[PDB]
Structure 1
Amino acid sequence: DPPTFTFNFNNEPWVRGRHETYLCYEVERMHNDTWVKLNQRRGFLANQAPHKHGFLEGRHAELCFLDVIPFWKLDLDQDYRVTCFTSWSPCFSCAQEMAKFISKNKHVSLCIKTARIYDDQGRAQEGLRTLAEAGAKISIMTYSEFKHCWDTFVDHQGAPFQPWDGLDEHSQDLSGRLRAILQNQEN
């Protein structure tokens, strides 16, 4: 057979927030002081809008699952068990908003293992610290959690996907930054 593989998750652009963004998530509906789930889906698609009919601004992972919450329309005492797997930690307004819903109430546990993000300081740090501090537990899902990212949302668990050195660069970035952003250690 001819050795021809397609890598859309590699270094090659495939997120940039909105638009055809490769993203994955996992959410559970917490009820009766416990945890439960009433759906069968692992990860997410590489685009916006989960279903058809009803889409204007679009949901980029952050507000995506955030939408799945009102989708269940829990009572109130319930809790949001949401987990995300994106190629980037936050988003300017997508995260700023997300952060709110999560920072506007104490009852939403999240684990966003993101690949990596690169921003100067302005027009990005807002959704960064906000969503990352009062929005969810953002993890640096680079080369390491990347291989695992597969082991969690792949039928084969860790598909034969080759990692790019950039992961070493980005990983080191998203991580070291995420520490500076959340900690706000200005130095």
Structure 2
Amino acid sequence: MDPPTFTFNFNNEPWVRGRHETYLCYEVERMHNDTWVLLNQRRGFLCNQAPHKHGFLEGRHAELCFLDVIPFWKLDLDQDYRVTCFTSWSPCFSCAQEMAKFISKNKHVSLCIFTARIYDDQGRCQEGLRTLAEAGAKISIMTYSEFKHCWDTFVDHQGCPFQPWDGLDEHSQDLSGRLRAILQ
């Protein structure tokens, strides 16, 4: 992922101004049946698929595209895995139920979703996040740590260390208060 795209998409300044896409970075770690440790399996990122006459007519949300690729990972079906997602926006109502379905029918997948801004359409989105948590997914807001991790792991930084934008911590704190209230 190029630096301008990351910084533009994962900036946590409340404004819904220009950010019409949803980027999603994921990491997969095998549980390990004996010890306490996790094993690196794979990683990657993706974004939504805008409506297109030569593709998904009704559009393809990043969350749906993410679930589309898991089959291609070919994880041993009788093993436990940790799946972590860093998303620029939180899932819509429809994608939340879809992810909640996945983790409910699998059991061998621990899903942790870290989001930069919360997409709350003020309607059913809040309910969707409660459904995902009910399903056992960890839903949390990205802080300095998650932003830096993604920068170091998923960005072509070309050696440049991560440089936090002003207010990152502030917006991160506020969003955390809103999410905690949404859930409970």
User: How big is the shift at 1:60?
Assistant: 3.5
Structure 1 residues 38 and 65 mapped into 2: Cα distance closer, same or farther (>3 Å)? Answer: farther
> Residue 29 of structure 2 contacts residue 82 of structure 2 at CA under 8 Å; is this kept in 1?
yes
Structure 1 residues 119 and 173 mapped into 2: Cα distance closer, same or farther (>3 Å)? Answer: farther
User: How big is the shift at 1:41?
Assistant: 5.9
> Residue 140 of structure 1 contacts residue 175 of structure 1 at CA under 8 Å; is this kept in 2?
yes
Deviations 1:158-177 (A, max 9, x none): 84554444534531233123
Give structure 1 stretches of 5+ with no counterpart.
Answer: none
**Whole-Å Cα distance in 1 between the matches of residues 164 and 146 of structure 2?**
11
User: How big is the shift at 1:141?
Assistant: 0.9
Aligned pairs for 1:36-185 (under 5 A) are 42-48=43-49, 55=56, 59-72=60-73, 76-117=77-118, 119=120, 121-134=122-135, 136-154=137-155, 156=157, 159-160=160-161, 162-165=163-166, 167-182=168-183
Deviations 1:26-70 (A, max 9, x none): 235679999999999643134439999974555544333322222
**Whole-Å Cα distance in 2 between the matches of residues 154 and 4 of structure 1?**
9
Deviations 1:105-159 (A, max 9, x none): 4221122221121537532112211223425222311344212321332455984
**Whole-Å Cα distance in 2 between the matches of residues 59 and 3 of structure 1?**
23
Identical aligned residues as a percent = 97
User: How big is the shift at 1:181?
Assistant: 3.1
Give TM-score scaled by structure 1 length. Answer: 0.64
Q: Which has more helix, going by share of residues?
A: 2
- Bigger relative contact order, structure 1 or 2 (CA pairs below 8 A, ≥6 apart): 2
**Whole-Å Cα distance in 2 between the matches of residues 2 and 33 of structure 1?**
39
**Whole-Å Cα distance in 1 between the matches of residues 164 and 179 of structure 2?**
22
> Residue 92 of structure 1 contacts residue 128 of structure 1 at CA under 8 Å; is this kept in 2?
yes
Give TM-score scaled by structure 2 length. Answer: 0.65
> Residue 86 of structure 1 contacts residue 113 of structure 1 at CA under 8 Å; is this kept in 2?
yes
Structure 1 residues 19 and 35 mapped into 2: Cα distance closer, same or farther (>3 Å)? Answer: farther
**Whole-Å Cα distance in 1 between the matches of residues 54 and 39 of structure 2?**
22
- Please, what is the CA RMSD of the aligned residues? 5.5
> Residue 12 of structure 2 contacts residue 171 of structure 2 at CA under 8 Å; is this kept in 1?
no
Structure 1 residues 62 and 18 mapped into 2: Cα distance closer, same or farther (>3 Å)? Answer: farther
